[PDB]
Amino acid sequence: GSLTEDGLSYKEKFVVRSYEVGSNKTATVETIANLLQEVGCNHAQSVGFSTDGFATTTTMRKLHLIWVTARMHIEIYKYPAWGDVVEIETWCQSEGRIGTRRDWILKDSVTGEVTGRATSKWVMMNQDTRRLQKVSDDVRDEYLVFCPQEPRLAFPEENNRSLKKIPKLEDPAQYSMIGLKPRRADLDMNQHVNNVTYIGWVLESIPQEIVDTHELQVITLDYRRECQQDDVVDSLTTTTSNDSQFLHLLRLSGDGQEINRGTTLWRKK
Amino acid sequence: GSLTEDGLSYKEKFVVRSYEVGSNKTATVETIANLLQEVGCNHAQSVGFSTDGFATTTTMRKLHLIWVTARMHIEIYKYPAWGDVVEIETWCQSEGRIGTRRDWILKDSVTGEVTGRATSKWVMMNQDTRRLQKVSDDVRDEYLVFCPQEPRLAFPEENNRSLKKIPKLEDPAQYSMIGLKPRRADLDMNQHVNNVTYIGWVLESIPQEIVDTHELQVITLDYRRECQQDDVVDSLTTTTSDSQFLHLLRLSGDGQEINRGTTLWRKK
Ligand SMILES: O=C1NC[C@@H]2CCCCN12
Ligand SMILES: O=C1NC[C@@H]2CCCCN12
Ligand SMILES: O=C1NC[C@@H]2CCCCN12
Ligand SMILES: O=C1NC[C@@H]2CCCCN12
């Protein structure tokens, strides 16, 4: 792993491990998600930002401010096989006072073809109060020198799937997985439930018949609230659709408080 | 990763990843366990055996026979930090008709000091009937050429922790974590619940104040039965003492035993 020649992006190669593959002998979407997070963290380290998943500046730490993901969007064309080398490039861009965006391009190291792409929107919030806030000028200036100043988008299209509005699933859901609880492996270095865990929980309510005959092509997830260590979650899915599409909702098992919402698109294997 | 000069052992280096560390900025025991499994799998690949976690020979596949873990024992002296390079060496040894043993030595790449060690006992069984069998002469001859013929033990000391008898926890347990269920990430490439998941489940019933003030030094686990995708498990722990605990995993319904084990923790 290293920053690229112009220092405005970061690249790193990964060799798919035996325990990282699923029922098809290819990397799972959760293996891909961890690798996206790993390369994002290595990028923050390289330019001096925090490495705790909050990618903070010295000014942000003084003010108890952190970066939090509001939306994650991943599109995989080909899942790498066990032992394959995948190259991932990542970069950040400011979206003015709104927040920041981190993009990723996944490539097969051998052919150089783009096997996937991802985008994420991040908002600033006070860690203690949980209150969101627009990005200050001082913080913006600390980061802008590490970003390309001309737009560089992983999803440049006009009506791309990464910007689609996501509705709230209405009861009754077609399918459900109830009483899901995080274990210590589901928490990060700061005892917070990892965003990759939520991807796994969304996918738990997809029937096994879909998982067996299809491959996940797109997953978009809108994050609303954090799930604590002692929280219990219910994962809800309703079919909305050649391809299959689903609408997802994660909510607390008790009061039904919303944690996440999302959509998936699957293609016949 | 590569087989060593004499071809009777396999070595590989790993750089600790950001998502592999815990609340102490060091690798978790589950990160270590996955790396042990990864290097065991790379060893099987290198000499032509199956890479599905069963390490089968051509004769075993013809007879629907597989290798299954009966006991796992891990001892960690120092957990590697994020970004550190850990070298792991692994080898197998036949234990006659009983079964086979896989050993591991973990080292800090920079200093060369032994930061940890592990041992595992494996038994042969028909994958369909689940009936255990003593190892046939034909199968023994297929893999003896890949093993050191003189004993090479990660735990050579007589009366060592890796051989201790494990009793069954008696009700009431001091602590418990009930209704644990595996998700798809908890299954391997063949839709079976990964052995590393059981290590996580044993540790769920340890109080958080132990986890916060101590480091896990030793974990021994005796495997009795597999947990299916739709099974629900209860993890039970009682203090026996450093701090020591006795563990039991059992089905949430009938109380059928899945696993039993012991842990030893050192104050931070
Ligand atoms: O935390 C901050 N804020 C600005 C400065 C730039 C160099 C890396 C660390 N940085
Ligand atoms: O996890 C949380 N808690 C509130 C905030 C809303 C936007 C992104 C996700 N967030
Ligand atoms: O006899 C057998 N059965 C499978 C394995 C392949 C490598 C050579 C020795 N082998
Ligand atoms: O996982 C299973 N199923 C039966 C067998 C008995 C001893 C080794 C571990 N076991």
Geometric angle at alpha carbon A72, from A66 and A73, rounded to 5°: 155
CB-count burial class (<10 Å; 0-12, 13-18, 19+) for B33: buried
Whether omega before B172 lies within 30 degrees of 0, making that bond cis, reads yes
B179–A18 C-beta distance less than 8 A: no
Residue ranges of the domains in chain A? Answer: 2-163, 175-268
Cα A113 from chain centre: 22
Residue type, A155: F
Interface of A with B (CB under 8 A): 17-19, 21-23, 25, 28, 30, 34, 37-38, 41-42, 51, 82, 179-181, 183-185, 187-191, 194, 196, 200-201, 203-204, 211
Token pair listed for A69: 């993901």
**Distance between CA atoms of A142 and A134, rounded to whole angstroms?**
15
Inter-residue contact B46 to B186 (CB < 8 Å): no
CATH class of A2-163: alpha beta
Separation CA A82–CA B104 (nearest Å):
23
| DSSP three-state, residue A111 | coil
Which residues are bridge partners to B215 per DSSP? B266
How far apart are the C-alpha atoms of B246 and A140, rounded to whole Å?
53
Q: Do B28 and A184 touch (CB under 8 A)?
A: yes
Cβ B265 vs Cβ B243: under 8 Å: yes
User: Which of A257, A256, A248 has the alpha carbon at shortest distance from A220?
Assistant: A248
Which SS3 state, helix, strand or coil, does residue B208 take? Answer: helix
Find chain A residues with C-beta within 8 A of B201's C-beta: 183
Kindly report the nearest CA distance between residue A119 and chain B, in angstroms. 19
Closest CA to B13 of B4, B21, B1: B1
User: For residue A94, how far is the Cα from the chain centroid?
Assistant: 18
CATH of domain B175-267: 3.10.129.10
DSSP letter for each residue of A162-196: GG---PPPPSSPSEEEEEE---GGGB-TTS-B-HH
Query: In 3-state terms, what secondary structure has residue A199?
Result: helix
The atom number, within ligand 4, closest to the CA of B226 reads 1
The residue assigned the tokens 């050191």 is B148
Q: Which residues lie below 8 Å from residue A3, measured CB to CB, with a gap of 6+?
A: A9, A10, A43, A46, A47
Of A18, A28, A38, the CB nearest to B185: A28
Closest ligand by atom to B249 CA: 4
Cα–Cα dist A170/B109, whole Å? 55
Count other Cβ atoms within 10 Å, centred on residue B55.
Answer: 22
Helix (H, G, I), strand (E, B) or coil at B197: helix
Which two tokens mark A120? 């994420």
Whether omega for the bond prior to residue A172 falls within 30 degrees of 0, making it cis, is: yes
Nearest CA among A44, A42, A32 for reference residue A12: A42
Residue nearest to atom 6 of ligand 1 (CA): A142
CB neighbours (10 Å) of residue B2?
A: 10
Q: How many angstroms separate the Cα of B120 from the Cα of each of B73, B229, B246? A: 6, 24, 19
- Helices A195-204, A29-46: crossing angle, 10 deg rounding: 170
Which experimental technique did the depositors report for determining this structure? X-ray
CA dihedral A32, A37, A40, A41 (to 10 degrees): -140
Find chain B residues with C-beta within 8 A of A30's C-beta. Answer: 185
- Cβ-nearest to A184 among B37, B185, B203: B203
**Resolution as reported, in Å:** 1.7
Torsion of CA B90, B15, A117, A180, to 10 degrees: 70
Q: How far is it, in rounded angstroms, from Cα A129 to Cα A190?
A: 17
Tracing tokens 């790449």 back to the chain, one arrives at B109
Q: Which ligand is nearest to the CA of A71?
A: 2
- Where does ligand 2 bind, in terms of residues with CB under 6 Å? A 68, 70, 123, 130, 223-226
To test ligand 3's pocket by mutation, which of B54, B58, B66, B137 has the most ligand atoms within 8 angstroms of CB? B58
Tokens of B125: 């069984």
Distance of CA A175 to the CA centre of its chain: 23
Closest CA in chain A for residue B37: A19
CA distance A123 to A66: 8
Q: What angle do CA A112, A118, A123 make, to 5 degrees?
A: 145
CA-CA-CA-CA torsion sign (A202, A120, A187, B197): positive
Give me the CATH topology for the region B2-159. Thiol Ester Dehydrase; Chain A (3.10.129)
Token duo for residue A35 = 């690798």
The token duo for B233 is 């498990």
HEC-encoded secondary structure of A117-140: EEEEEEEEEECCCCCEECCCHHHH
B190 is catalytic: yes
Full 3-state SS string of B77-111 = CCCCECCCEEEEEEEEEEECCCEEEEEEEEEECCC
- Please spell the DSSP secondary structure of B238-258, one letter per residue: EE---EEEEEEEEETTT--EE
Looking at residue A224, the DSSP 8-state letter turns out to be -
Q: Which residues pair with A251 in a beta bridge?
A: A234, A258
Which CATH superfamily is A175-268 part of? Hotdog Thioesterase (3.10.129.10)
Six token digits for residue A142: 């600390």
Cα B111 from Cα B239, distance rounded (Å): 36
CB contact under 8 A, A184 and B41: no
| Residue of B57, B63, B92, B146 to mutate, ligand 3, most atoms within 8 A of C-beta | B57
Strand, helix or coil for residue B139 = helix
Q: Would you give the end-to-end CA distance of chain B in angstroms?
A: 33
User: In angstroms, rounded to a whole number, what is the distance separating the alpha carbons of residues A56 and A71?
Assistant: 19
Cβ distance B19 to A37 under 8 Å?
A: yes
Using the structure block, give the residue that is written with the tokens 């290097």.
B39
Which residues of chain B are within 8 Å of residue A203 when distances are taken between CB atoms? 184
Tell me the CA–centroid distance for residue B53 and ligand 3, in Å.
Answer: 16
Residue B167 CB coordination number (10 Å)? 10
How far from B210 is each of A139, A193, B217, CA to CA, in Å?
39, 20, 13
Which residues lie below 8 Å from residue B192, measured CB to CB, with a gap of 6+? B53, B226
| DSSP symbol at A26 | B
Q: Rounded CA gap, A123 and A98, in Å?
A: 7
Q: Do B2-159 and B175-267 have matching folds?
A: yes
Cβ separation B200–A190 shorter than 8 A: no
CA A68 – CA A59 distance, rounded (Å): 16
- What is the rounded CA–CA span in Å between residue A262 and residue A168? 9
3-state secondary structure of A113: coil
Query: How many residues does this entry show for chain A?
Result: 269
DSSP H or E run through A29: helix A29-46
Supply the residues of A annotated as catalytic. Answer: 190, 192, 227
d(CA A235, CA A251): 7
